[PDB]
From a paper:
Pannexins are single-membrane large-pore channels that release ions and ATP upon activation. Three isoforms of pannexins 1, 2, and 3, perform diverse cellular roles and differ in their pore lining residues. Pannexin protomers retain structural and topological similarity to innexins, connexins, and volume-regulated anion channels but remain as single-membrane channels and participate in ion-conductance and ATP release. The PANX isoforms, PANX1, PANX2, and PANX3 harbor substitutions in the residues that control channel gating and can have architectural differences that form the basis for altered properties among the three isoforms.
We elucidated the structure of PANX1R217H (TM3) substitution to characterize the effects of this germline mutant and to understand the basis of its defective channel properties. The arginine residue at the 217 position (TM3) is highly conserved among vertebrate PANX1 orthologues and is buried amongst TM helices and does not display solvent access unlike the substitutions studied earlier. The structure was determined by cryo-EM to a resolution of 3.9 Å. Despite the lower resolution of the structure, it resembles PANX1WT globally, with subtle changes in extracellular domain (ECD), extracellular helix 1 (EH1), and the intracellular domain (ICD). Mutating arginine to histidine disrupts the H-bond interaction network within TMs 1 and 3. The G44 in TM1 that likely acts as a hinge point facilitates the TM1 bending and displacement as a consequence of R217H substitution. The displacement observed in TM1 translates to an outward movement of ECD that could facilitate greater flexibility of the pore lining residue W74 to constrict the channel. In comparison to the PANX1WT, the modeled side chain W74 has a χ2 torsion angle shift of nearly 80° towards the pore leading to a constriction of the pore diameter in the mutant PANX1. A comparison of normalized conductance to voltage for PANX1R217H and PANX1WT reveals altered voltage sensitivity (V50) of the mutant channel from around 40 mV for the PANX1WT to over 100 mV indicating reduced voltage sensitivity as a consequence of R217H mutation. Binding studies using MST display a significant decrease in ATP-γS binding in the PANX1R217H mutant compared to PANX1WT suggesting that mutant behaves differently than the PANX1WT and have reduced ability to bind to ATP-γS.
Residue numbers in the entry:
A (entry chain F), B (entry chain E), C (entry chain D), D (entry chain C), E (entry chain B), F (entry chain A), ...: 2 to 13, 26 to 155, 194 to 300, 305 to 312, 326 to 356
Write the structure that this text describes.
Amino acid sequence: AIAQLATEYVFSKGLRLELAVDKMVTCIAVGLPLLLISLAFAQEISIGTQISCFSPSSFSWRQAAFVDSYCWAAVQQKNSLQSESGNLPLWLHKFFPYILLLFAILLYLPPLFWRFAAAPHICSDLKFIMEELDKVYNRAIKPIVEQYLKTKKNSNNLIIKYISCHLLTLIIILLACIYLGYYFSLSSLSDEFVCSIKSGILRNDSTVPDQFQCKLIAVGIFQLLSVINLVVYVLLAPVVVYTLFVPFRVLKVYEILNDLSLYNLFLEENISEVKSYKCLKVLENIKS
Amino acid sequence: AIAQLATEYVFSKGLRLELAVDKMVTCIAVGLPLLLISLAFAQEISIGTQISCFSPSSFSWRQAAFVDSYCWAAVQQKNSLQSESGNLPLWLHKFFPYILLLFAILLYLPPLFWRFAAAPHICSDLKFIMEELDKVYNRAIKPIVEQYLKTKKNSNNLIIKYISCHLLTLIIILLACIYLGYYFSLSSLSDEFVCSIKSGILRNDSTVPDQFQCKLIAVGIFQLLSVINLVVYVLLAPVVVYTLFVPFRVLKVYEILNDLSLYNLFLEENISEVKSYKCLKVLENIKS
Amino acid sequence: AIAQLATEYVFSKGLRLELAVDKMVTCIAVGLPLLLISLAFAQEISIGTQISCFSPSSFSWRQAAFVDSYCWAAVQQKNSLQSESGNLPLWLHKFFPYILLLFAILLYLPPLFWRFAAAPHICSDLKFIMEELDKVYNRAIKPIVEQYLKTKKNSNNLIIKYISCHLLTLIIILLACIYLGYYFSLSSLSDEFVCSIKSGILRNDSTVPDQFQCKLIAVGIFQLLSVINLVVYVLLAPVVVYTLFVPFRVLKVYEILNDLSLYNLFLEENISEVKSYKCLKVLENIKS
Amino acid sequence: AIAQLATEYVFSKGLRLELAVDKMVTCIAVGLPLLLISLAFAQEISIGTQISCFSPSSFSWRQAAFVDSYCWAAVQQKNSLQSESGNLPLWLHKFFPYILLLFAILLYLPPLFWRFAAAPHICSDLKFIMEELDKVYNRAIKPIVEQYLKTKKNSNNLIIKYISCHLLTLIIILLACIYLGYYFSLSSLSDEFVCSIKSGILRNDSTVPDQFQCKLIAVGIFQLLSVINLVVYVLLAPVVVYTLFVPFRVLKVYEILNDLSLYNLFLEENISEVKSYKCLKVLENIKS
Amino acid sequence: AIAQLATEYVFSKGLRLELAVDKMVTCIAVGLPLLLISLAFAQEISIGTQISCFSPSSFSWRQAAFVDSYCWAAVQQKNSLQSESGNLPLWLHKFFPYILLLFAILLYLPPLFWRFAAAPHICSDLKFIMEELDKVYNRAIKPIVEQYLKTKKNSNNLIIKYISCHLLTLIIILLACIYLGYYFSLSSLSDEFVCSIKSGILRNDSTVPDQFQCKLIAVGIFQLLSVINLVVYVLLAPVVVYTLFVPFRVLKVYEILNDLSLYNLFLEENISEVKSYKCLKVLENIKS
Amino acid sequence: AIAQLATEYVFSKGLRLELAVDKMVTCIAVGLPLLLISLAFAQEISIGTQISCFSPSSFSWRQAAFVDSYCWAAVQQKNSLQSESGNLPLWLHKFFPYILLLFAILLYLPPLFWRFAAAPHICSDLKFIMEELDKVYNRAIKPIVEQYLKTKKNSNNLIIKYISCHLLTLIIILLACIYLGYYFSLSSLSDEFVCSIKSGILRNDSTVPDQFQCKLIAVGIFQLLSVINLVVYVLLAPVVVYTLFVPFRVLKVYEILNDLSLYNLFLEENISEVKSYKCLKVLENIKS
Amino acid sequence: AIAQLATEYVFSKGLRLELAVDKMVTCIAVGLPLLLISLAFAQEISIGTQISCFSPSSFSWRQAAFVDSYCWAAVQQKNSLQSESGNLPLWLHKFFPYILLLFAILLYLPPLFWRFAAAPHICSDLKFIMEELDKVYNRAIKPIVEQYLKTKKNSNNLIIKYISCHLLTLIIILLACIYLGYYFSLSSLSDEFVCSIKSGILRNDSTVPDQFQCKLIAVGIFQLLSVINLVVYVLLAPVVVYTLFVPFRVLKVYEILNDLSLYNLFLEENISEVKSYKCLKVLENIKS
């Protein structure tokens, strides 16, 4: 049904530095294609078969079903049928779900790749940094970390990975958007094509008509889903490029009492789970 | 069935300050469309296909099924069929479930957005505040928090987010209500339309009649669900605007013994889980 | 089947003061409609379609199916069919499951509303009261709570909510019972109605007969379920009004060694989980 | 199938005093109707529809299906069909599953009622009694409970509830057994009845025959299930009346070293979970 | 399918004295009927309906289906059909699955009865015995249990229950084996029977032939399952009678350093979970 | 589908001495038949019914279906049909899945029998041995076990059970392999057989032809699965016989600082979970 | 559907040294065939049967279905049909899913074999090594491990197993890629073949035509899935050979303060879960 789709797609010492306020972007870019595919072939809208041939009155049920199946499997053979637009729109109308799944997988892969290998190292590094900071504060209440900060600043082995990971997703979004823009530009009449069953010995028989009629079914639904995906992706595109400006958008709090941008972001997002942080916030917020 | 819908839609150191007595509003505004969609296409009411063409007696099963499928997929093509009202009512009758799902998602998004990013900061802040208050009371039994309170009062970075989040939902409710008001105003006869299969080479044949008959099925159910949603939403609308008046509707309890409104609400809703609160309540309730 | 319904509907420091020996009433008033709806449309009784038109012999399968679907969707249009009783009984026979679900939701809502907001405050209050009582008894073994009791007695902010919550349910039961009384009073012949397919250009054709026959199917099952619900609700009605008399139906146990009614009930129902209660019961039961 | 029924019906500081060696009786009296209903409508035996009308050769598929549905829904109308036995056997053959479910619910209710309200009080009482006994024994190793025992003996507020609860079940068993005895006494030919479709304008037409034939299907299965339930219940009946004699069927163990019957039973069934009980058993078993 | 059957039937301070190396016998005697029933009506072998009537050419689909259903429900009526063997083989061919389920339940009941009531008492007794033995050994490292052993030897209230429980199962196995021996002895031609639809007013009509043909389908599968069950049960029978000789097949280990048979078995099977047992085993194994 | 088969068959103080690097052999010998059976009757390949009779043109749907069912159930009766090869190949083609399940159960039984009864004793023995060894090493850091080792060496009550258990599996593999070798040797034309419906009174009628045609369907799939199982089993056979040579393939590690083979294997496989083992390994690995 | 495939295939003191940054390769090489097989036979694309025969007009439904089934099961018999390409392409088109599952199993086996037997030994070895290193560092703060390192360097019993395990997978990938390259090279017309039903006595009849037409359906989908698998595997191939160069791609960190490659990799990947590692990293990162 539909209740089994929306309730599972969107209704369903560990730092949150992995997602970087980008988990929502991946979730909405990977679950939307799946949700649209599930609702397109649901038991409510996809009532009829995707293809329905118009066989003559002389034909029985079996011959008409054979014509239907043949014309369904003769879409790829250019020598069988003929259309003014060509076989590319028919190919797209036949293989839209598979390429939608391909785009879904292309979106899903890079975040999992980032989480699998590049997440544990920086996360353990940030636990180490926060533990050292807490120890320093406890000692002061009752300095070598700055050296680590400047050495990490001199490092260049992590920001490149982040920008590559968050540029691959933008490239995939651009490709999907331009593809859907091309797809929505179809004349919407290409589903009308003439199917001819005259292959092999069937040439001798004259009872079968030379050419048939065949219109694809459930084509407007594909167009509506495509335009919905197009508008969602064009709305979402600026978010990723806004994220890409990491160094252009905390650590300097205690005062007396380059890859550095990523570490700064991870440090400033982690203010919770430690009691001393909020106490210092209030103490040098009242003073300043 | 129906037992699998109602039992899962409504029958199915952590502060509750996230929901602010508004979790019920989101739940009833997001589960009702899903419940109605599930019951509309249940195995009890949606017995018949949404479309049933009346083919002549000469046609066999296959030709009639082809006519049915074509007219189902010819609703979008304005050049095929013709109706006095136009193709807009037919579009709505075809795509009602998808736009209902769209409204469901539009309701579901803002609460999750609020819970994902704006909830942890204020929640950790309130644990800090209550811990400081408990420490102050324990010290008194055996003052810097007021400075934090007035600094938070001078702040303006949280109330704006709350009012925007709870105004977006009101805007979406208004849009859904006006749309359903338009939809219920349909003449209920627009489902009667004339379908003609005369596209392409089928022009040569004269056996097929020029024009057919075609009435949509399961249309009154859509109207009843639409009016039910309309009445529910018009009843629910005042609740959100009542909530929006946060500063116009506790902290001053112990006595001797602007974003401030949100913090005041979160403080007054959190009186449980601490033993000293009820003891103070009784002590300066007997005295005052 | 049926095994999946009965086994899940009825076979499937925390005080129990929320339910107040009324959880059973809500459970039997909310699960019975669901159980009846599930068994009505089970794979054992709902074998046949709800509607079966009698088309002439000339018509083929497709024309008869079209007549069936049209007459199913022409029940709401008063200008199509005609019956002596009117279109109200037909409306009821078509929309019985939906209104049953509506009554189920109307029963389910008030208990959840009471549990969501009015339960935690009084429950935390009763833990506070019992903890204070236990501390007082421990001190005596090795008095300010009475002041709290009399102040709560002077309060009037909780009994009104309880009586309103347990009067709304009675009102809904009365409405459901009177509706089912009206429904069972149907002549049981209203399912016989004459359906005419003469809308639009089909006027020109003379092959179609002017008027058809159409009897609804699975109508007696609805009547039996309605009368079962009626008898269950009329039997259940006195229970709620008996509950409503809260102040007219413990705390005075230890002796030397108005909203007050609700607190008294919650106190007397909570005698378990504390060891001193039973010891005092036996000590001043032997003496008195 | 069948594997999903038997494996889930019978193969699937807390005292066990709630069940009193009667949990098996409730389980076998509540799961047997469900198991029989599930196996009756399984995908192995219930292959055919419950009703099969014999329409003439002139009728097509649709007219025969309409006759089938009408005669299925015309069983309740006494003016349509006619049988020598009457409409009561037909009513029973139509509504056997629903009344079986009704008997199942009538068996299920009283044990849950007993467990919900009358179980916690006596169970907490027995933990109190056993704790006091253990404390007394520990003190003796290194007497006020008898007063509690005699006061409970003078009480009369619990045995009445138990006997009423275990007499209601016997009454329901008697009613079910006598009903099944009546049902098995059917002539087994009442399923043969004459169905006439001559209601309304169909009177004018002469093509339809005046009277039809109609035999119910899957009727012997109902008779076999009914007789199986009858024999099971008549075998089970003496168990409940044997249980009812509670005072006529331990506490006097330690020696030097009326509702009383229920407490005595609960005490003697609880000898486990305490180490001193078995030690005393052996010590004054060797001596006596 | 089949993967859902085998993986769930056989692939799917607490002493193990309950099973007494007999859990396997109960498991294989209760899961085999269920497995065979599930595989008999699987979606691979039970492709065809159990009954297929041969109606004449004049009959349409509906009349043939009515004949099929009638002859399916006319097997019990001896006056309708006639066969040389009689109606007993037809009864068996119709009700084989139900009696197989009955045998499955008859096997399942006695082990659960033994585990429910007779298991906890002896199990708690054996924990008491092993704890006393461990305490005695600890005291010796740094005698009243023998009195308990001889008193239990003088007792006769447990061995009788065990032998009755393990003789009831043998009786049920004997009954099932002799029944399957009778069933496999069928001539395998009894499924050929002549069905006549001439009941009631249908006597007047002459179009229907006087007598029909009707052969049951999926009958050889039942015979193969019956013979498989027969061979399994005849192979399994000696195991139970071998078990019954409990006193004829440990405690005398430490040395210086009648119901008694059951306690001896339970003691000797429980050598694990205690460290001193294996140490004593090696110490007086080296010496003796 | 297929995703539900492969993901659940192969993708889905406790010593591992039970399996002895033979758990994989049992898993691949018990899950392969189940996987092959599941994929054979999947919703992708088993599209068509196993049997398809060629009835004449005069026959309608019902007579052809009756012929199909009869010939499906007339395979066992040798007097009905006739084939040059005989009824044995037809029996095998009909009952291949059941005998495959039988082989699966025959493989599954012996490992479970070994794990149920013979595993706990030796496993507890090995915990005792390793605990004694650890205690001896701790005492040495700050000898009676050798006596236990030689007494176990003199014992002969466990190796026989192991060799019998791992020879029964080899015997079953040999039987399955030779059976599949016979089955693959079928002429593959035995599925062509002549079916005659002339039993009983149908002899009088002359419309039915004397002999029919009937070819089994989904027979090549069975042959391919059989040859796959054959090659897998012939490849797997040497593994079991390699395992059987237990005494011909550790304990002598510490040095200064017959059933014995099984205990030696269990000891040498258990080097983990104890810290002293690896330390000794390195200490007398550097020295030797 | 499709939502049940992608969400479960890719969306769904313990060291991670088992996977060695190769878990992703196994996951994508084992889940892709399963995902493609599931989507190929989904309820959206696999609408039509794989085979559709074109029977003449004289044939009824049953004869056409028999022809369909026969030609489906006559693909293997070379003497029945005839095609210019041969029976090999038809064999491949019939058995593509089974060989895809075979390749999936061939990929799945080696990683599980490596994890089952070769993982625990080296993993326990690495816990021992890291514990010894931590103890050495703690002693230094308040050397025999190097001897273990050089002895392991002299060992040659583990690198061979790793290279064999990661070369078997490469061999299987090469075989799958070359097979798919052959399969995609099919002329795509081989699905056109002539089927003749003239086996056995059917030779006498002349009504059946000598030769038929038969085109396979859902063949282009197989080609697209094959080419997708081909491109994925050819892209993935260099990853495995890059991994194979283990010795050519840490331990030397503390300084004053051959199978060796695998141990070095496992050591350098395990820097987390120990506090001293990061502290040493910063200390001799600032100095060097």
